[PDB]
């Protein structure tokens, strides 16, 4: 049986899944391709598997669209993106592995534009459109993951491909005026020395104030003020980072805001298990949607034993925060449809020092839970230790057993009856070292005690939240058997973790709200929703 298969998260019926590939919307239908091993629970024989939806939650299967069948992709069909041409026509640019094991860029387009499921795709015998050679001097073994392409104000298409040269990450930009003949621009859009391979790049605009998404090609109105986000997947650190800045269309370079740097010190989308992110414009609801890949935290032996590996996070809506400092993410509202009509609700309850409160009457391994925490006296908070800068290091140096003035308080999810197994998601509040009344809010996802099985990835994840602890603290968790997605400060901080409990499964799982800090905290409001399964394949 399968106690770790997700109820409502996207995953194939069996075996290895990888990056999300070319997400898009065509003729009112959502499309999601992905890297898949059609015959193994490890990486290998990789092809573009294909599924579709009308709500981004329930998915219908289709035979693999892009698979090795030609010289330009004979040894593999790696990640890529989908562009929607101004005439509504969709195209895919993807990385193929050639007879010499070189990473080359191939175009593919639909065979029957009237088929709204876009079942079969044809490849141009002119592929590769973009390839390494002796004159460009591009590293043949690191030249992959082409982005969604944008059209500039000089009627020329621009697209970037992630690469590297001697420990220098760079986003190589190409230009075309017909989307068939692509010439390499003399200089990259951006680069960074020190950070390794610049995998899964992404480049998209956002409005300075608003929740609504922006079309990729858009220059905006004469009244609408725009900023740009460059996102990259660092292969060295295995994380996804982004910076916010301005797109100099003259010099064709990306200039990050004052303070940002495009390396391992940039903001992340998710401070847990989260890789190879890709966005697309959803013209139906005028929103930008983020897809992310979460790989398995269990041993490889366990993966082949259960016969599958890798799930996809429930899609997030993304926009720019009012303060302009960071991006905000929130699970697409369609997921809220899976909530049972019945809803367990608790309000105005006081968790005193070293206390717990079980949430009764919910399917505790497949649920959605939202908490509001009110702190009583803010000057009871401890002052942050001078050289405490890495939020992940705070959460691992001091577990739930080590107490602060304020914190740990939050949720204990996927928990056994007598608490032999629990995954804790909590807050800690410190005073900042500054002269003013500034506070540091910490959000941890501790999975050191998450499973009795010894050889699982027990790594603890951590993040700072940009919220004011004068106001009530917001925490949300989507729980799905082996995956939990934690959301702090209304999507200002996101943590995904993977848990494989030996006791806390299905009927036997529990849910707790807790507090181990010196001072008691108020639970202003608490709502738990049992979650229905989704029709995915
Ligand atoms: C796909 O999934 C696999 C499996 O889940 C992923 O591979 C594993 O990745 C994780 C990291 O994400 C690694 O697991 C552990 O790594 C930890 C590294 O040790 C540090 O952990 C904390 C900070 O990161 C911190 O508590 C600790 O500090 C202590 O030591 C420091 C000196 O090093 C120093 O600051 C102090 O002395 C302090 O006491 C460490 O810095 C750790 O928990 C374990 O060591 C463990 O290795 C593994 O490397 C990976 N496991 C495998 C299977 O290789 C993989 O990333 C995923 N891939 C993708 C694409 O997402
Ligand atoms: C081009 O990229 C390849 C692939 O990363 C580099 O070769 C790797 O070098 C690293 C050393 O850090 C080692 O892991 C292996 O020796 C190589 N990996 C594989 C699987 O090929 C190569 O050094 C790069 N060359 C240049 C000039 O940038
Ligand atoms: O399917 C390959 C696809 O995955 C990415 C990012 O997840 O890279 C992974 O696979 C590469 C080839 O095996 C590895 O070099 C790399 O370490 C790993 O992250 C994309 O780069 C690629 O398109
Ligand atoms: C394309 O798909 C449409 C709609 O499903 C179908 O009617 C038609 O036969 C296909 N086009 C051709 C002529 O192959
Ligand atoms: Na594209
Ligand atoms: Na939404
Ligand atoms: Zn359907
Ligand atoms: Zn990609
Ligand atoms: Zn790391
Ligand atoms: Zn000290």
From Swiss-Prot:
Upregulation: By wounding, aeroponic growth condition, darkness, sucrose, glucose and mannitol.
Major location category of this protein: secreted
Membrane-spanning parts: none
Gene3D superfamilies (UniProt xref): Exo-inulinase, domain 1, Glycosyl hydrolase domain, family 43
Alphabetical list of SUPFAM superfamilies matching this protein: Arabinanase/levansucrase/invertase, Concanavalin A-like lectins/glucanases
Sites where the protein binds substrate: 16-19, 35, 43, 78-79, 144-145, 199, 235
Pfam assignment, any one: Glyco_hydro_32N
Tissue expression notes: Expressed in seedlings, leaves, flowers, and seeds.
This protein's GO CC annotations: apoplast; plasma membrane
Glycosylated residue positions: 112, 139, 295, 399
Effect annotated for changing residue 235 to F: Loss of activity
Cellular location(s): Secreted, Extracellular space, Apoplast; Secreted, Cell wall
Catalytic residues, chain numbering: 19
Keyword Magnesium in annotation: no
Positions of disulphide bridges: 395-444
Top-level EC class as recorded in UniProt: hydrolase
Ranges in a coiled coil: none
One example GO MF annotation: beta-fructofuranosidase activity
Reaction equation(s) it catalyzes: Hydrolysis of terminal non-reducing beta-D-fructofuranoside residues in beta-D-fructofuranosides
UniProt family annotation: Belongs to the glycosyl hydrolase 32 family.
Protein name from the UniProt record: Beta-fructofuranosidase, insoluble isoenzyme CWINV1
């Amino acid at each position: 049986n399968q106690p770790y298969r997700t109820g409502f998260h996207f995953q194939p019926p069996k075996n290895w899944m990888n990056d999300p590939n070319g997400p898009m919307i065509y003729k009112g239908i959502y499309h999601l391709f992905y890297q898949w091993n059609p015959k193994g629970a490890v990486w290998g024989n990789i092809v573009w598997a294909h599924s579709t939806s009308t709500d981004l939650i329930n998915w219908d299967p289709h035979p693999p669209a892009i698979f090795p069948s030609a010289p330009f992709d004979i040894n593999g069909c790696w990640s890529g993106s989908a562009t929607i041409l101004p005439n509504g026509k969709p195209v895919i640019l993807y990385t193929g592995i050639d007879p010499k094991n070189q990473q080359v860029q191939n175009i593919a387009e639909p065979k029957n534009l009237s088929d709204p499921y876009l079942r079969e795709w044809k490849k141009s015998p002119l592929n590769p459109l973009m390839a390494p050679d002796a004159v460009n001097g591009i590293n043949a073994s690191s030249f992959r993951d082409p982005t969604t392409a944008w059209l500039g104000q000089d009627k020329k298409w621009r697209v970037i491909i992630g690469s590297k040269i001697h420990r220098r990450g760079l986003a190589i930009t190409y230009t075309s005026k017909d989307f068939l003949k692509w010439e390499k621009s003399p200089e990259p859009l951006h680069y960074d020395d020190g950070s390794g391979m610049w995998a899964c790049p992404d480049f998209f605009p956002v409005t300075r104030f608003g929740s609504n998404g922006v079309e990729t090609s858009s220059f905006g109105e004469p009244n609408e003020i725009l900023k740009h986000v460059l996102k990259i997947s660092l292969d060295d650190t295995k994380h996804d980072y982004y910076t916010i800045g301005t797109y100099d269309r003259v010099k064709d370079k990306f200039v990050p805001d004052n303070g940002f740097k495009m390396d391992g010190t940039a903001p992340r989308y998710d401070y847990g298990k989260y890789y190879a992110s890709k966005t697309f414009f959803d013209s139906a609801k005028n929103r930008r949607i983020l897809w992310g890949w979460t790989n398995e935290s269990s041993s490889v032996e366990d993966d082949v034993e259960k016969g599958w590996s890798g799930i996809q996070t429930i899609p997030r809506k993304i926009w720019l925060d009012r303060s302009g400092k960071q991006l905000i993410q929130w699970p697409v509202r369609e997921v809220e449809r899976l909530r049972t009509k019945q809803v367990k609700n608790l309000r105005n309850k006081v968790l005193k020092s070293g206390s717990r409160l079980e949430v009764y009457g919910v399917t505790a391994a497949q649920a959605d839970v939202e908490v509001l925490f009110k702190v009583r006296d803010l000057e009871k908070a401890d002052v942050i230790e001078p050289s405490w800068t890495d939020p992940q290091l705070i959460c691992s140096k001091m577990n739930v057993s080590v107490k602060s003035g304020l914190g740990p308080f939050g949720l204990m999810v996927l928990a056994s009856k007598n608490l032999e197994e629990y995954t804790s998601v909590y807050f800690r509040i410190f005073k900042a070292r500054q002269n003013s009344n500034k506070y540091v809010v910490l959000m941890c996802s501790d999975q050191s005690r998450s499973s009795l099985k010894e050889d699982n990835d027990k790594t603890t994840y951590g993040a700072f939240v940009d919220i004011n602890p004068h106001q009530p603290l917001s925490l949300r968790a989507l729980i799905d058997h082996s995956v939990v997605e934690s959301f702090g400060g209304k999507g200002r901080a996101c943590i995904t973790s993977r848990v494989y409990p030996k006791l806390a499964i299905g009927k036997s799982s529990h849910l707790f709200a807790f507090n181990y800090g010196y001072q008691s905290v108020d639970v202003l409001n608490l709502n738990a929703w049992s979650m229905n399964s989704a029709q995915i394949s």
